[PDB]
Amino acid sequence: RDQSTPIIEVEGPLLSDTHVTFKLTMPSPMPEYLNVHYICESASRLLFLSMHWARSIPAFQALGQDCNTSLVRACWNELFTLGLAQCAQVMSLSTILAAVNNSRIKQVMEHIWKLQEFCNSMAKLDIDGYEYAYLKAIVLFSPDHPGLTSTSQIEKFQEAAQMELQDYVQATYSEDTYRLARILVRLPALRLMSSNITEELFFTGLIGNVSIDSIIPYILKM
Amino acid sequence: RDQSTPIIEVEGPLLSDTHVTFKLTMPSPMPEYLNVHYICESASRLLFLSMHWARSIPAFQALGQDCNTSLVRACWNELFTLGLAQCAQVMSLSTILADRIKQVMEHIWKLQEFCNSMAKLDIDGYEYAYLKAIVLFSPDHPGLTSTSQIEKFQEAAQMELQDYVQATYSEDTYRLARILVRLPALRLMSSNITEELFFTGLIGNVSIDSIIPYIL
């Protein structure tokens, strides 16, 4: 009913001003040709670019490293996939490899399916850069995942994010009222997709063996 | 886009703009005694009601019959959990003591916080029913048939739920959003643990993903 100091006796859950700033930008450059196993590096650029976008949020750094590192550890795959559809301009990854080679109903197909279908849905809805920046925001500041240390602070961020995201849709797309809701009903799809299947498929090269989850903390350093 | 006939002969009609008030009645008739393994019964009492609620809805049956027993079989946990935020029951959540890592706890937590947050938001009317529609008619799920038609239903429920909120409120204009950003939680809990926790007192091994087709 009245939280100026969180469950603990250190922080102070302070309300918001203006959440996300100019983060609406997200470029993703890439070097040379043909489909070897540089894929790992491609997904890395996104993965990396994703960690920074989030670490750059004036309300994210407030949570402190201990809380940040954990939050991100709880949704990197949602962010990665959100951005996947947003930068899907590259992905020609028909990485459906058919299974030592002397003189097993693994459903990785479903995951790839859901993945394509989600990108597609978001394309069909023509989600713009702004909505993406906020959609990622609503995802990042989820009070659902267990193991989070912020109390109502995180809650107060998701509130603003969805708040500020209703406003942008409210104006920018006045011909469509049921659009916002149409966008929010996409978020559940991000949870249906397994983080592991996503890791096995993209990150295998170098980052693949080390467990992206353990590397997260260092990616948040620089 | 442009979709009026699937990739065959059949077709997809647009919303009839309706889902009768009978889709608001969720009274779970519970037992009488103390807390034995009757939690499995209350669980079933809710499961069977939940599944029977989704079948009352016309758009459901119209969606063929195979597709029916495929869609619900793909979200039952979500519905049961949604409807589980309807504690006309007691403290069945004391599921205590158990070599294990006991991840179960974490699950009880999620289900706990969810029921809390749902209650904190006061789900006025049975927006639950409409949220159960958004859940029921999810195109996300694999192995689904009339995908496009389901989208039409889910799209319907999306609009109606909206027209019920901003038309039944003023002070909270950001409600719709708020109540929508809750759905993802539902996909954050495993059905396995749910089945393993509540329906842990049924005839031997029978998995819920089996008894589903047996609808009356």
Swiss-Prot record, chain A:
Residues 1-222 form the NR LBD domain. Induction: Induced by oxidative stress via FOXO3 activation. It is found in: Nucleus. Phosphorylation on these residues recruits the corepressor, NRIP1, leading to transcripional repression, whereas the non-phosphorylated form preferentially recruits the coactivator, PCAF. Homodimer; can bind DNA as homodimer. Heterodimer; binds DNA as a heterodimer with NR2C1 required for chromatin remodeling and for binding to promoter regions such as globin DR1 repeats. Interacts with PCAF; the interaction preferentially occurs on the non-phosphorylated form and induces NR2C2-mediated transactivation activity and does not require the ligand-binding domain. Interacts (MAPK-mediated phosphorylated form) with NRIP1; the interaction promotes repression of NR2C2-mediated activity. Interacts with NR2C2AP; the interaction represses selective NR2C2-mediated transcriptional activity. Belongs to the nuclear hormone receptor family. NR2 subfamily. Orphan nuclear receptor that can act as a repressor or activator of transcription. An important repressor of nuclear receptor signaling pathways such as retinoic acid receptor, retinoid X, vitamin D3 receptor, thyroid hormone receptor and estrogen receptor pathways. May regulate gene expression during the late phase of spermatogenesis. Together with NR2C1, forms the core of the DRED (direct repeat erythroid-definitive) complex that represses embryonic and fetal globin transcription including that of GATA1. This is Nuclear receptor subfamily 2 group C member 2. The chain holds residues 348 to 582 of 596 of the full protein.
